[PDB]
Nucleic acid binder design. Sequence first.
RNA 1: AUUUAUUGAAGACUAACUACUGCGAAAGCAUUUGCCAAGGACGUUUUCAUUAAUCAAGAACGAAAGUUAGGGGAUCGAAGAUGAUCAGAUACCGUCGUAGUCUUAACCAUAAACUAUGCCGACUAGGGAUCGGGUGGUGUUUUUUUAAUGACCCACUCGGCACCUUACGAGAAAUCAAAGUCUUUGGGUUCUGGGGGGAGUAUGGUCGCAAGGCUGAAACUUAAAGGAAUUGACGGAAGGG
RNA 2: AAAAAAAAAAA
RNA 3: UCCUUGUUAGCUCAGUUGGUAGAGCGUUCGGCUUUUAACCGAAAUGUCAGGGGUUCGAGCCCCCUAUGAGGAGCCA
RNA 4: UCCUUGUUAGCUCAGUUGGUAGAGCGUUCGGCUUUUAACCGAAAUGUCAGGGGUUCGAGCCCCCUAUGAGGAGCCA
Lengths: 25, 226, 97, 127, 63
Amino acid sequence: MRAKWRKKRTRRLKRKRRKVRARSK
Amino acid sequence: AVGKNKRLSKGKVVDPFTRKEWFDIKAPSTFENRNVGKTLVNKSTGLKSASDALKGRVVEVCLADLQGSEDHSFRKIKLRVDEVQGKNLLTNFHGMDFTTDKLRSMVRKWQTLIEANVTVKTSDDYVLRIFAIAFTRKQANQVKRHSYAQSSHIRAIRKVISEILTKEVQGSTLAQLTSKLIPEVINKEIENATKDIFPLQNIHVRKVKLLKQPKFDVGALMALHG
Amino acid sequence: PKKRASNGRNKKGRGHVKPVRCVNCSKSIPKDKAIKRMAIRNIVEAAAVRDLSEASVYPEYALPKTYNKLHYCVSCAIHARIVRVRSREDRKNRAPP
Amino acid sequence: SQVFGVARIYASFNDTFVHVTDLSGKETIARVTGGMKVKADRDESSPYAAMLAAQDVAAKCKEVGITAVHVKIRATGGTRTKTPGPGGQAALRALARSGLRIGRIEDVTPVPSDSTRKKGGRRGRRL
Amino acid sequence: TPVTLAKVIKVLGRTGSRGGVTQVRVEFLEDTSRTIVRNVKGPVRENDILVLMESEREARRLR
RNA sequence: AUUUAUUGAAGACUAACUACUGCGAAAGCAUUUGCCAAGGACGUUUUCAUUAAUCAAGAACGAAAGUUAGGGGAUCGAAGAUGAUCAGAUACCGUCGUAGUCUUAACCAUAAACUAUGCCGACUAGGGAUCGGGUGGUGUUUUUUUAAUGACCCACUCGGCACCUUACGAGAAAUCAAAGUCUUUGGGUUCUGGGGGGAGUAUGGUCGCAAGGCUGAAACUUAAAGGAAUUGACGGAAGGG
RNA sequence: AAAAAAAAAAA
RNA sequence: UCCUUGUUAGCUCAGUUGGUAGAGCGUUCGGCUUUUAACCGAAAUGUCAGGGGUUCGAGCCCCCUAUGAGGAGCCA
RNA sequence: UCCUUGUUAGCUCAGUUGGUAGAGCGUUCGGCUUUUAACCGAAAUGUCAGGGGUUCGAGCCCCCUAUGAGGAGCCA
């Protein structure tokens, strides 16, 4: 697939992980 | 498309060219011709007073169709209606302008274009926008193919043009000015004023647009129309 | 790899060109890469010009013309049967016919 | 000797308006269109339809008494194509064959000084 | 029910995806000196004659 | 209704001139006019006298989108709503259209931010054209025949954007007047890379209102990924038959 | 300038 | 109950007392594209809402009912 | 328990007592294509939940059974 989309996907994932770790902390 | 319409009307014949009538139109005296045409309104009823609906009009016609010659063939003129007396209604100058084809033909590439504009009043309290134009021309013996300018020459040329038009207008009233335009002497003045700077072909001036009128002065309009 | 020393266009020393719009598909493209042509044409046609001059007052008038500069993009041009494609060597050639 | 009007042709893709007026343009006559002469919604702009419109406006001008016309041809202009549709020249030829007299043809297509913005987006009307 | 005659003077070539159509220029018999371009369906020659139910129309030039 | 004519308001844009043309460190910059301060090149028998080159750390500017707050809000228009198309189509096409597009005051600090070619310097083949400046010429033209200027022509030169031809040279080649002067290997200097993936991911830092940026691995996995060109085949790519 | 999706791998 | 409006082919709509009435759709066939058509040519289509009456002639003009829509109002 | 509503082609669903009842998808057949899809032509299919009755005639009308779903189950 396209790097633009892999990057977008990854950014959304980083965001989600950030907020759930915020729940923990 | 013919029978495609769903509803002609939201809520759910009289021939008027029998109700209409024609009108001869008179240009001013700064013109070789006067009888420009014919114009349509409804019968001046007791409520409408067709003279006014006829009065607030403007018409475009060519300077060649005014002076006979095909030299002033592009050169439209906008004439305003201001007065009526029995089916020979008068007109006054409302504006001049060029034709698309002529302006475009003037505009070629590999020759620098110059444009100016002034927004000046007159002796008789009119206000006008006189647009000027010019194009660099390739001298004879010239080889280099484009003949562009150096932009200080352009600033200076535009200064010259502006002060020239101001000097002429302030002193030329409106019709004195129109008869200054028709023979195209301003072009001669401009090329003589700028030849010591740069060649400058194609200096046919450009449109001129009334921005503000003074009061009516039926006296002057009558002095025009004989 | 590199197909063109000009790379598509006529930009060597600017950076930016304030583009324009291809008329057939309203598409943005720079003015240095655009295809520019110019269409100057008699208004009517060499066929009906005779009917015009016959039914015309003001004899020998002018037959004026209409002038418009046309910016097409690459795709619309090649679809409209213009600069279509050339081999390598004649791709380097730059002058018209 | 001559009674002159103003032809006001607007030739666009998808249509062709042919309508005529007095020299001032306020009192108007004989506005008719390709869709008023045919029923397709695709041949609105077609030369046959424009020609029929021209024949009809010629009939109407002759029934009024008008004999000649100065011509103002126009395309959409503004931000759109600026080039006339196919029907303009056909309408012109049609009325000139119909019998009216002709003058002062001019392209009056409204043109901007670098207008606002054109529709379709920077990537185009993709198809 | 008026018609018009014309003389085929100059045959140009074929048109159509399937090439069963011709483009020709023809001279009006009456009101001559008028030369108009038209389509044809079938076989045709020079010097020929055509019968138009309508005269004031020409087909797309393909050249 | 559309269309025509005459007007006014709004806000954006600055056409055609506009080009193998200009400026600016880059991003970028186009109506006119004026004010402010700056800058290059050229000219110089002016002055200073080695003050210089490139540079970590550290600083300024930094397209678009985006964010905050005010104004504005005409077009076009992510989202969204809709009409089609299609097996489906919340995609392509069409009609509407909030945000945004615009501006002030702040942030963000990225980009195919590309010439995908770091900067300074020297030398090496030809040819012509062009932009700015300068020089010479009983050269041409304009004025007041004349002068002086100005614009054009010829020659020359400095500095620019570039360009055409060849390859002596170089290179994997494409191609290149630098990507040459490097196995006959060294002019000075900063940055960067070490098979491909995982991964510009995780973690920890720090900057930021946020979005995110900058820095930045490991496990594990793999024998090929890849570059330039050749001959074919194929094309809802063109041309001819 | 409507439409026109897919074809196990191995050599 | 008062006034107005409509009852029409399978759906929806137009109609002058000189017509068992005209429209697009639906579908019967035929063109038409290689065809999928968008498309074009000919048919059938409406006890013209129901029943009375006037008229040389009523979807049509007069009376009534039923039906649907809108607004007005309502002493058993 | 009560009140209200439903039961129809394999699935989802339509109906004015007057046809061993109708759609779409599915299934099957032929074609197009190298092949499958899509596409084009065609077909066949139901004991209308069961049981009584009214009628000349019941998917419809009324009544019980089964099943389904919605609601009610309150004040202390």
